[PDB]
Amino acid sequence: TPEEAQREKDTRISKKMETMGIYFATPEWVALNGHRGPSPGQLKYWQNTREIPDPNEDYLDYVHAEKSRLASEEQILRAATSIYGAPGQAEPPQAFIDEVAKVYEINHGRGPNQEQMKDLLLTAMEMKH
Amino acid sequence: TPEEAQREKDTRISKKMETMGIYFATPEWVALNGHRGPSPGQLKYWQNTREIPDPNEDYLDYVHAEKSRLASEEQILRAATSIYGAPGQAEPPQAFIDEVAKVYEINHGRGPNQEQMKDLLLTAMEMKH
């Protein structure tokens, strides 16, 4: 049956997308999108806004806009650990990881500039002393 | 001696500021600032940029600009736990807290809008199933 062959296909495409962490791409989202995975614009709209892309929108302005930087809590922790510099490279205090987190928020997902790096290094030195 | 009385005063003001998590306000920063804590503009410049305010700048544009929203990792975890809704209210998977983190970065420290809330709720439901 072309119906079951259609449900399996949507399920297959959706599984592929979610394995990559593309969470909006459910089998129903994929059905609505004409039984195909997201176009470049749909992916980049989602990546940059975290809103579910309309299956019936193409997002042509997000196909060739390229800012797009964001940090997970792992990335934030690796940045904070590098800046803090504790012996045996142990985790920084939570108060420090929070200042680093807020820097990534201020910068829309980008990492600390030079001036911010100085603030963070100043902060780290007070917390170790 | 007015010198020791000056060092104690700077130390006193600085201790007060750092107890509040105002980390740039070292005793040396306080000395340079004419032996006073930060003005409203200096605090708000720091809060909104995370750069050490110049002791010899007043930051008049930051005295009456009021966006200023930011989230610690505690706030992010409380938002993620509320949205995820696991029994006994146990911590969400790290992959979920990371999607919530990235939403706060996209929004410059503000919390998820309605469209983003839908994405996150969709995400939570896939991770529990």
Side-chain angles (χ1 to χ4, degrees), chain A residues 1-77 79-129, chain B residues 1-77 79-129:
Chain A
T1 57
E3 136 69 30
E4 195 53 24
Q6 200 64 289
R7 189 182 243 116
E8 286 165 72
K9 182 203 174 79
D10 295 336
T11 301
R12 193 187 67 239
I13 293 162
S14 175
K15 253 197 84 177
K16 190 180 205 260
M17 301 299 132
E18 278 163 35
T19 216
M20 278 179 280
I22 304 159
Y23 301 118
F24 72 84
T26 59
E28 297 82 30
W29 190 95
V30 170
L32 291 166
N33 198 53
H35 311 289
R36 68 135 216 243
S39 69
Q42 287 164 325
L43 262 165
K44 275 290 181 180
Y45 175 78
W46 172 75
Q47 186 179 35
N48 293 3
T49 67
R50 246 70 181 181
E51 305 173 13
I52 295 157
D54 187 351
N56 268 135
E57 198 162 345
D58 27 30
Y59 303 98
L60 284 89
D61 2 59
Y62 291 91
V63 184
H64 277 272
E66 210 66 70
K67 184 260 148 197
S68 193
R69 193 165 161 190
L70 299 168
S72 64
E73 288 198 347
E74 284 77 63
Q75 195 198 125
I76 296 167
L77 178 74
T81 300
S82 139
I83 298 160
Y84 196 74
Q89 223 49 240
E91 288 196 55
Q94 186 62 50
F96 184 77
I97 312 170
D98 288 328
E99 287 297 295
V100 179
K102 286 182 176 192
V103 168
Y104 279 89
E105 297 171 14
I106 285 159
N107 295 339
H108 308 242
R110 306 179 163 340
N113 64 28
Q114 296 156 238
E115 294 296 327
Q116 290 168 329
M117 191 59 62
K118 288 186 273 188
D119 175 271
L120 292 178
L121 281 150
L122 184 57
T123 298
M125 302 193 70
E126 284 155 4
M127 292 179 181
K128 299 188 284 178
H129 185 247
Chain B
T1 57
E3 136 69 30
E4 195 53 24
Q6 200 64 289
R7 189 182 243 116
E8 286 165 72
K9 182 203 174 79
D10 295 336
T11 301
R12 193 187 67 239
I13 293 162
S14 175
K15 253 197 84 177
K16 190 180 205 260
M17 301 299 132
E18 278 163 35
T19 216
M20 278 179 280
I22 304 159
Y23 301 118
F24 72 84
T26 59
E28 297 82 30
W29 190 95
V30 170
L32 291 166
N33 198 53
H35 311 289
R36 68 135 216 243
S39 69
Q42 287 164 325
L43 262 165
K44 275 290 181 180
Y45 175 78
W46 172 75
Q47 186 179 35
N48 293 3
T49 67
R50 246 70 181 181
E51 305 173 13
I52 295 157
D54 187 351
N56 268 135
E57 198 162 345
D58 27 30
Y59 303 98
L60 284 89
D61 2 59
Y62 291 91
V63 184
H64 277 272
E66 210 66 70
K67 184 260 148 197
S68 193
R69 193 165 161 190
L70 299 168
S72 64
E73 288 198 347
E74 284 77 63
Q75 195 198 125
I76 296 167
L77 178 74
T81 300
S82 139
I83 298 160
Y84 196 74
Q89 223 49 240
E91 288 196 55
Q94 186 62 50
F96 184 77
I97 312 170
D98 288 328
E99 287 297 295
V100 179
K102 286 182 176 192
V103 168
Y104 279 89
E105 297 171 14
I106 285 159
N107 295 339
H108 308 242
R110 306 179 163 340
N113 64 28
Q114 296 156 238
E115 294 296 327
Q116 290 168 329
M117 191 59 62
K118 288 186 273 188
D119 175 271
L120 292 178
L121 281 150
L122 184 57
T123 298
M125 302 193 70
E126 284 155 4
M127 292 179 181
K128 299 188 284 178
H129 185 247

